[PDB]
From a paper:
Here we present the high-resolution electron cryo-microscopy structure of the Arabidopsis respiratory supercomplex consisting of complex I and a complex III dimer, with a total of 68 protein subunits and numerous bound cofactors.
Apart from high-resolution structures of the polypeptides, our density map of the I + III2 supercomplex contains a total of 94 bound cofactors, lipids and metal ions, including a butyryl/crotonyl-CoA molecule in the γCA module of complex I and ubiquinone/ubiquinol (Q) in the two QO sites of the complex III dimer. Furthermore, we modelled 4,837 water molecules. In the Arabidopsis supercomplex, complexes I and III2 interact at three distinct sites.
Numbering used by the authors:
A (entry chain K): 1 to 100
B (entry chain a): 3 to 60
C (entry chain J): 1 to 174
D (entry chain e): 2 to 65
E (entry chain A): 1 to 29, 55 to 119
F (entry chain f): 1 to 101
G (entry chain N): 12 to 499
H (entry chain H): 2 to 325
Write the structure that this text describes.
């Protein structure tokens, strides 16, 4: 039962990220945090499979995905900062001017 | 020679460090029968598990 | 059982990430999730990844999130909303994902039911692979820089983009 | 399929992989390599092994 | 082997208990500064640099010249980024 | 590091040297290789000069353009010379020099 | 050892040149002596030069790109298909850069880092085209995506640009996570990430009753990421907002190059791999949805940029019809449609960039253009009629294959939808012609004449659009060649 | 495993005593430099002063200001104290004298160091005081800045050793102590340790007289004591790490029978004591940098030099094939 238990752990993390997207319509910072949660779940999926399959490819890609997660968070938080600086607020009603 | 006053707390610190080493070393030795071996790898663990059988079943 | 404990801690901490009213609290719970993940990694024997998750996710990424969220001083009125009216939409979407995606491995990876017999004696030991065991660290390092070096360098390019973008978007030189 | 094992030796399922690949490299119909393919996938997931052992456990629970 | 991590967990539990005892016995008797974000970004980058250094450092005996120069190229890219940050004033706190 | 120069598409001309050394490839540079090299470098220097006038850095811009052109032109000449020695490009001169030395 | 790297000479050169330009720009932009000169145009010219030299290196070394293929096999795969894809990508990047100089100097966008980020994204897309493993594909996609996130937010004091960036980063990161999940499921189910290994494992079985749900959902999630990238409905709504809110040169660049790169990826993953009818049905349903929604939403638009965004969504629906029918002619038609759509989009955005010097925003702002600039109004009218697919303009090729694929595969509902959406598209395209030629507004907007770069690019693309179907043989042959090279 | 808690206590309790007496030793040495006596009334030669101060602290009423972060405010000192304690699980005092013989011990120490910042950050934010928050932000930035140089120096040692095992790092110095060829690296490491522990000349939280409030200004009773104890335990740990990496840990100065008579734990202790004395001496000798100056030093001086030493050591060892 080990492999099903390790996989459902990562799976609950992924579903939690999805739920965080669904439940945070006024809070886009938490939406970013939910996306990181999904990325963490995928990283865990690669590591578990590497062990289960006795193969190193899952481990190389896990490290590279960590690099991508870091760069993603850096750029995303920069964009958050400049949006806040322009508006003085992070409320979603001030980032809805592009439409139609 | 008054400066020797300052060497007492430092000596106490050094003795404390010696205790943190030696007390944990002797407790482990008493419990396991031999001192801790640095670098216990898969081979050593397999050796100990097989040696349990080779001893007890003799 | 131990995986039940760690998964329960991760479940609760993740719910706290997505449901805490204060975003600083969300960042702190996120840190608890990464600690639990590191515990799982230690169970898998991947101590390098277990430590790196602490160093990078908690030591660098979460610190960045905490610095940014703390200086924002978000008022709850700007991000508050009642979530009782989402229970149905989360129920279908969660259930469908639950029914499909927690059980996707079941048909391919059928679990071994633990029997009332000692199967431990059927574990076969090959001592040949135990003469010179490799750490997780050296197994990874045998591959990153020679056989898959191009992907390594592309990741470096990704980090360079991050540095440039951080400067160009936020810098206001005094 | 890569062959790099997590402990620094040949991966567990790599010889099965290579037999399957070598078969498919000259058999114009993949149905001729079905047996080797299912051997590779059995090495990855142990599905039939665990199913058979669960049958044994089931019969034990039925006769008790 | 992961055996050596168990004493660390028991050590953590004991240290936590000592902390609670010490802390609990006395109960008986709006100015955003971007430079912090920037230093966080720089720390993130060099944190990943150290991360990638670790396997390389333990693997130098096996990867030989090819691994050395591949890591050198990695460092060259990251150091060009560092030079960019230096010139732009990201390293000045005045 | 195990290496294998073997290409997917085989050479259509006689193979004078399967994996020519760097210095051998450079010494194999012909007059046409030098013409390509010099043309690419000169165009690059010209672009650097002309694009540098408005910012006021025409000299340094010439140097930057010239560095880009030098590297690109050398890479192009090396590409041609190595491809000729390997039989991927028409290599009458290489074959003639090979059948004699 | 050195000769092994002949397979990556183009990429080495462009990366090194990008580093040189980064150093040049940062050293002289900070120079008090030179009074902090703007270097966006200087670096732009040097980077256009670098792109052209990269194109020369790649085009002239066709066989050498396949050298040492066994050594490079676990990193990438270069062939005839990647050859032509990468040439077309470099040509598009060069054109987009050439269209940026008036924007640099008249707006005074002085940031040279814009050019560096464009060049790094071009490096990423080059590696995307040659990717032959899920890991390499993901890494190259992420490099490209991060560069776009940064450049979409380049007007960092603008509400519109910051909004675009924020929406892009959030939705892009979400879709990337979904795709990575799919990749993890496929690896866990097959033990492989290399495209050759995946082809061997998946071929001959598709859904033979005992189907790997892990393999089936990994494919689905990867397809969702791909569809987000090509702005296919229902994963499209990021595209109109990002296209409108980004700086117009960014919008022009995003409209062309990523499509080339990601379709290269889609061909080599799906077409070269094997789950099968399920995935062609995915692209079938998304094509129909994209055509319908693009037509209707474009009909609703009053602004030029949003109209072009929705037009591109509809056209990717038309293109994906070719991927769906799963034949050599389908692939060829998809490639022909990408080439022609790219040249038409380049023409349209050259006009838009020319008009942005007087801040064109609304379709009604084009009023009386046939009076204030007759040859410009005609040129823009040719582009619109080509977008509408009126023969014998180049745009007629996509309409012709849309109906060619429906009638033969038996798809009468698709033909119905194509007829309706083509008529709707023609209406909202000729509305622009009516605005420039038929209307008599009380207030006119007089536009500043375009620069030489855009006039030359417009002149060449306008001859191509009018005259392509007189001599279409080279495109037809080159695209048949590429379609065949995917499997042989 | 039943005897493991005894070993853990035999580590933790003498460490707490050692910290209590490190405070006294700092006071004594500082006084003697200043031509005064320092504590010499409370107990003979002032040796009972730490017990009296600790007793006073436990008998002090806690304040717990009316903040909205009631839990976080008390948990921050617990976090920093526990992190200071747990690094000692992998520290070897002699051959075989170590609680956890981690193969990944070097990276584990780096991880603990990286975790140390959260106690300070949370104390600053939770205290509901703009001065504490600003001071905590500055201190956190300084620690993360010098962590980069610490990590790169760690990599230099790792290149020399080829293993993350601390005991292996010690035994790799049997031929020569790493502090001899890498002496500038050792100087860099000691300075970075000063900055990482918020110690003079880098002690921003001690600069109240400079209008720079510390992160722990709102703390009283045992939360403040926990912060103080964690800081001094970290000073002892940094001295121990300097000893392990560059002075050959428990090894004798010379491989001779006369030196091999005295136990390795005593060698290790003496080297640690030298480094603690240098901590105190430096605090006694110099004024402090401003925040901006020390940040400039962290990013502009120590990072480039650490990276250069990484490159030079690796290149030299690869060239002549002297790698482990
Ligand atoms: C202010 C206050 C003041 C007061 C106070 O507090 C502060 O002040 C404080 C100051 C404290 C003292 C500080 C220090 C010691 C020394 C310790 O005693 C030596 C430690 C024991 C083990 O450690 C050694 O051994 C290691 C391994 O070799 C050495 O490693 C080598 O090798 C490494 C690898 O190559 C290299 O890397 C290293 O460099 C290299 O050195 C390591 O260095 C060395 O330490 C001594 O072992 C022996 O005992 C064994 C017993 O079994 C006997 O075994 C024999 O019998 C077996 C059975 O037949 C046979 O099987 C065996 O073959 C056969 O040998 C035998 O006699 C002999 O081995 C006894 C405790 C005491 C007095 C402390 C008492 C408490 C205090 C007074 C505190 C006090 C409270
Ligand atoms: C620096 C900062 C500070 C913070 C921090 O870092 C950062 O600090 C860091 C410090 C970290 C902790 C460090 C350490 C641990 C311990 C670990 O826990 C070990 C658990 C493993 C080891 O457990 C046993 O392992 C061996 C047995 O396996 C025992 O060996 C015997 O057996 C040998 C064989 O006969 C003999 O040969 C030997 O002679 C004989 O002795 C050995 O004694 C014993 O240890 C795994 O075990 C389980 O796994 C099994 C498989 O799944 C499960 O089996 C079950 O399922 C099967 C079907 O699947 C059924 O068939 C079975 O019937 C059915 O039972 C079952 O649940 C259970 O066994 C859990 C994680 C944790 C807490 C970490 C958390 C995170 C931190 C706090 C980090 C934290 C983040
Ligand atoms: C001026 O700078 C200074 C400080 O910062 C202001 C100090 O905190 C301190 C003193 C801080 C301490 C003495 C903390 C010492 C704490 C310990 C040794 C561990 C606990 C010791 C105790 C006597 C508490 C006993 C608690 C119990 C529940 C009794 C059962 C055991 C000094 C001496 C100082 O000079
Ligand atoms: C049959 C095709 C299918 C249907 C589509 C038709 C699309 C067009 C719609 C037809 C309705 C009427 C269209 C009226 C357009 C004719 C008027 C026109 O375009 O004249 C242009 C002429 O536009 C051109 O410049 C067209 C040039 C295209 C060149 C194509 C010829 C290629 C070979 C010729 C070689 C050179 C000339 C040889 C002899 C000297 C004048 O432009 P202005 O804006 O008025 O002024 C220009 C400025 N200045 C005069 C000072 C220079
Ligand atoms: C802060 C420091 C900056 C340093 C910047 C200078 C160095 C940057 C790296 C430049 C590339 C290498 C330049 C050094 C020339 C000497 C190379 C050499 O000595 O040849 C060796 C081979 O060296 C190499 O081939 C490694 C080249 C490193 C890769 C650099 C990347 C170049 C382009 C890669 C294209 C991929 C796309 C890039 C993605 C961004 C011979 O080794 P061997 O064949 O005998 O055996 C192999 C080995 O010993 C066993 O594993
Ligand atoms: C094909 C590309 C070849 C290299 C392009 C050079 C890159 C920089 C040149 C851009 C053009 C330029 O420099 O514009 C300036 C000046 O424009 C030029 O004079 C052209 C500069 C050189 C371009 C042509 C020279 C020969 C180029 C041959 C190929 C090299 C500024 O114009 P102005 O403000 O002085 O306008 C006032 C006047 O009324 C205009 O009508
Ligand atoms: C954009 C606007 C189009 C440009 C106008 C037309 C271009 C005509 C220039 C070529 C004339 C002379 C070519 C010289 C020549 O044959 O040498 C070859 C260079 O090819 C070349 O120069 C190849 C040019 C390819 C043009 C772009 C093709 C795009 C394909 C459309 C697909 C788009 C969808 C992507 C998802 C290399 O020699 P060789 O023949 O040995 O090399 C291939 C072997 N296999
Ligand atoms: C008015 C009368 C017609 C109303 C619509 C008829 C719907 C039924 C058509 C149908 O059976 O659809 C099948 C699937 O086509 C499809 O593609 C499914 C229907 C279209 C789905 C995508 C469009 C949804 C709407 C988008 C805009 C609105 C957005 C939401 C507000 C066609 O069968 P086949 O063509 O596969 O047969 C291939 C044979 N060789
Ligand atoms: C196929 C259908 C039929 C096509 C017809 C083919 C005929 C060939 C074309 C013949 C061209 C006729 C004119 C030649 C003489 C003009 C020479 C240009 C003068 C020049 O140096 O221009 C500079 C600007 O560069 C420029 O203006 C050059 C850049 C122009 C953009 C085009 C190239 C961009 C890169 C490739 C794009 C590919 C896209 C395809 C996907 C400086 O101008 P100035 O001195 O007036 O000062 C402008 C203010 N700064
Ligand atoms: C990727 C590939 C993309 C390449 C795009 C292809 C060009 C696009 C066409 C748009 C403008 C071209 C004008 C059409 C030509 C009109 C007359 C056609 C014709 O017979 O001319 C021949 C071709 O001329 C030419 O070569 C036409 C001029 C080129 C512009 C010369 O006849 P020929 O006997 O020399 O050629 C053997 C075939 N008739
Ligand atoms: C490629 C591998 C590594 C890649 C990364 C590193 C690349 C190296 C760094 C490149 C960054 C750009 C360097 C620019 C140097 C400009 C120097 C300078 O100030 O020049 C002014 C300096 C003095 O002139 P002034 O500006 O009139 O005072 O030099 C010149 O302008 C010389 C002009 C004549 C040069 C023509 C020949 C050029 C051929 C190519 C060399």
């Amino acid at each position: 039962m080990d492999l099903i238990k390790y996989f459902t752990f990562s799976m609950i993390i992924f579903i939690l990220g999805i739920w965080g997207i669904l439940l945070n319509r006024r809070n886009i910072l938490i939406m970013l945090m939910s996306i990181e949660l999904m990325l963490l779940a995928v990283n865990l999926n690669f590591l578990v499979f590497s062990v289960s399959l006795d193969d190193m490819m899952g481990q190389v890609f896990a490290l590279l995905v960590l690099t991508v997660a870091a760069a993603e968070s850096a750029i995303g938080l920069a964009i958050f900062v400049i949006t806040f600086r322009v508006r003085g607020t992070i409320a979603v009603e001030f980032i809805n001017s592009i439409q139609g | 020679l008054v400066w020797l006053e300052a060497m007492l707390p430092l000596g106490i610190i050094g003795g404390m460090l010696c205790i943190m080493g030696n007390s944990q070393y002797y407790i482990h030795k008493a419990y396991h029968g031999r001192p801790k071996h640095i670098g216990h790898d898969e081979w050593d663990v397999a050796m100990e598990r097989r040696d349990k059988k080779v001893v007890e079943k003799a | 059982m131990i995986l039940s404990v760690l998964s329960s801690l991760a479940l609760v901490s993740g719910l706290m990430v997505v449901r805490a009213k204060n975003p600083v609290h969300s960042v702190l719970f996120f840190i608890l999730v990464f600690c639990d993940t590191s515990g799982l990694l230690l169970l898998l024997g991947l101590d390098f990844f277990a430590m790196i998750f602490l160093v990078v996710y908690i030591g660098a990424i979460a610190v960045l999130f905490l610095f940014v969220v703390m200086m924002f001083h978000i008022q709850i009125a700007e991000i508050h909303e009642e979530v009782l009216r989402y229970l149905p939409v989360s129920g279908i979407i969660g259930l469908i994902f639950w029914w499909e995606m927690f059980f996707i491995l079941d048909n391919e990876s059928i679990p071994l039911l633990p029997t009332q017999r000692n199967t431990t004696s059927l574990r076969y030991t090959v001592y040949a692979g135990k003469v010179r065991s490799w750490t997780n660290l050296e197994t990874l390092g045998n591959l990153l820089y020679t056989y898959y070096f191009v992907w390594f360098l592309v990741s470096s390019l990704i980090l360079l983009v991050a540095m440039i973008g951080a400067i160009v978007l936020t810098m206001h030189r005094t | 399929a890569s062959g790099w094992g997590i402990t620094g030796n040949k991966g567990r399922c790599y010889d099965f992989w290579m037999d399957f690949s070598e078969c498919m490299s000259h058999c114009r119909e993949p149905k001729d390599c079905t047996l080797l393919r299912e051997d590779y996938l059995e090495c990855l997931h142990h599905s039939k092994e665990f199913q058979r052992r669960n049958r044994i456990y089931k019969e034990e629970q039925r006769k008790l | 082997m992961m055996l050596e991590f168990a004493p660390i967990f028991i050590y953590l539990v004991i240290s936590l208990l000592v902390s609670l005892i010490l802390l609990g016995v006395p109960f008986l008797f709006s100015r955003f500064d971007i430079r912090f974000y920037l230093v966080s970004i720089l720390f993130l980058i060099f944190d990943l640099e150290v991360t990638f250094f670790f396997p390389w450092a333990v693997s130098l005996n096996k990867i030989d010249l090819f691994g050395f120069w591949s890591m050198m190229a990695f460092l060259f890219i990251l150091t060009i980024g560092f030079l960019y940050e230096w010139k732009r004033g990201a390293l000045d706190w005045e | 590091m195990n290496t294998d120069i073997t290409a997917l598409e085989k050479a259509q001309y006689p193979v004078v040297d399967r994996n020519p050394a760097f210095t051998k490839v450079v010494g194999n540079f012909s007059t046409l290789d030098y013409l390509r090299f010099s043309t690419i470098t000169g165009i690059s220097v010209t672009v650097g000069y002309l694009s540098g006038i408005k910012p006021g850095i025409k000299g340094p811009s010439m140097v930057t353009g010239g560095l880009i052109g030098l590297m690109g032109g050398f890479m192009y000449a090396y590409q041609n010379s190595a491809g000729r020695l390997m039989g991927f490009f028409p290599n009458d001169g290489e074959v003639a020099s090979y059948q004699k030395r | 050892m050195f000769n092994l790297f002949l397979a990556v000479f183009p990429e080495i050169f462009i990366i090194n040149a990008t580093f040189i330009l980064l150093i040049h720009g940062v050293v002289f932009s900070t120079s008090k002596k030179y009074d902090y000169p703007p270097l966006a145009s200087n670096v732009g010219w040097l980077g256009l030069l670098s792109v052209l030299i990269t194109l020369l290196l790649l085009a002239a070394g066709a066989p050498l790109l396949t050298i040492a293929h066994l050594f490079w096999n676990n990193l990438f795969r270069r062939d005839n298909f990647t050859y032509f894809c990468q040439i077309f990508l470099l040509l598009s990047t060069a054109g987009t850069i050439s269209m940026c100089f008036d924007f640099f100097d008249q707006e005074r966008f002085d940031a040279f880092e814009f050019i560096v980020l464009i060049l790094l994204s071009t490096c990423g897309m080059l590696f995307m085209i040659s990717a032959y493993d899920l890991i390499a594909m993901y890494l190259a996609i992420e490099l490209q995506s991060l560069c776009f996130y940064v450049i979409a937010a380049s007007k960092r004091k603008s509400e519109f640009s910051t909004e675009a960036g924020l929406k892009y980063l959030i939705l892009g990161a979400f879709s990337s996570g979904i795709l990575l999940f799919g990749c993890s499921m496929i690896y866990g189910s097959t033990g492989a990430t290399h495209f050759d290994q995946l082809a061997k494992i998946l071929t001959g079985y598709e859904i033979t009753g005992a189907r790997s749900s892990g393999i089936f959902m990994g494919i689905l999630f990867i397809a969702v990421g791909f569809l987000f990238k090509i702005t296919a409905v229902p994963f499209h709504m990021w595209a109109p907002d990002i296209y409108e809110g980004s700086p117009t040169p960014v919008t022009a660049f995003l409209s062309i190059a990523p499509k080339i790169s990601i379709f290269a990826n889609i061909l080599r993953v799906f077409i070269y791999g094997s789950y099968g009818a399920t995935l062609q049905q995915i692209f079938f349903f998304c094509s129909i949805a994209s055509m319908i929604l693009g037509a209707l939403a474009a009909m609703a638009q009053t602004k030029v940029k949003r109209l072009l965004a929705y037009s591109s969504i509809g056209h990717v629906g038309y293109i994906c019809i070719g991927f769906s029918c799963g034949t050599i002619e389908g692939i060829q038609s998809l490639l022909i449609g990408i080439f022609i759509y790219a040249l038409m989009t380049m023409d349209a955005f050259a006009i838009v960039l020319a008009l942005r010097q007087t801040r064109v925003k609304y379709i009604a702002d084009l009023g009386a253009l046939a009076k204030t600039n007759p040859i410009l109004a005609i040129t823009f009218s040719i582009t619109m009629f080509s977008y509408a697919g009126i023969p014998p303009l180049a745009g007629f090729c996509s309409k012709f294959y849309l109906f060619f694929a429906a009638l033969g595969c038996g798809a009468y509902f698709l033909a119905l939808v194509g007829v309706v959406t083509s008529v709707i598209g023609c209406f909202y395209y000729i509305r622009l012609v009516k605005r420039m030629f038929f209307d008599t507004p009380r207030t006119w907007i007089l536009y500043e004449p375009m620069d030489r770069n855009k006039s030359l690019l417009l002149a060449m693309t306008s001859f191509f659009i009018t005259l392509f179907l007189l001599y279409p043989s080279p495109l037809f042959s080159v695209t048949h060649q590429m379609a065949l090279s995917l499997y042989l | 495993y039943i005897a493991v808690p005894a070993e853990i206590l035999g580590i933790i309790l003498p460490l707490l005593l050692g910290v209590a007496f490190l405070v006294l030793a700092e006071r004594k040495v500082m006084a003697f430099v200043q031509r005064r006596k320092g504590p010499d009334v409370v107990g003979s030669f002032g040796l009972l002063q730490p017990l009296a101060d600790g007793l006073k602290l436990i008998l002090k009423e806690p304040i717990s200001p009316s903040s909205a972060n009631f839990f976080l405010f008390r948990m921050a000192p617990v976090a920093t104290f526990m992190l200071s304690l747990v690094a000692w699980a992998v520290v070897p005092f002699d051959y075989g004298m170590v609680l956890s013989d981690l193969n990944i011990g070097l990276l584990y120490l780096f991880a603990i160091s990286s975790l140390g910042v959260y106690g300070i950050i949370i104390a600053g934010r939770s205290s509901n005081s703009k001065y504490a928050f600003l001071g905590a932000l500055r201190s956190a930035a300084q620690m993360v800045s010098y962590e980069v140089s610490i990590g790169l120096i760690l990599i230099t040692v790792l290149i020399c050793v080829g293993s993350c095992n601390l005991s292996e790092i010690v035994m790799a110095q049997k031929q020569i102590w790493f502090g001899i060829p890498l002496f500038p690296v050792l100087v860099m490491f000691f300075i970075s340790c000063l900055a990482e522990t918020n110690r003079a000349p880098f002690d921003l939280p001690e600069a109240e007289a400079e209008l720079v409030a510390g992160y722990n200004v709102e703390y009283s009773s045992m939360g403040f004591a926990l912060f103080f104890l964690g800081e001094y335990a970290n000073m002892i740990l940094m001295s121990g790490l300097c000893t392990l990496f560059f002075l050959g840990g428990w090894l004798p100065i010379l491989d001779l029978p006369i030196f091999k008579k005295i136990p390795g734990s005593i060698w290790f202790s003496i080297k640690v004591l030298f480094f603690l004395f240098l901590y105190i001496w430096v605090r006694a000798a110099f004024p402090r940098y401003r925040y901006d100056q020390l940040m400039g030093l962290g990013w502009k001086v120590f990072l480039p030099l650490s990276l250069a030493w990484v490159v030079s050591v690796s290149g030299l060892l690869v060239t002549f094939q002297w790698l482990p």
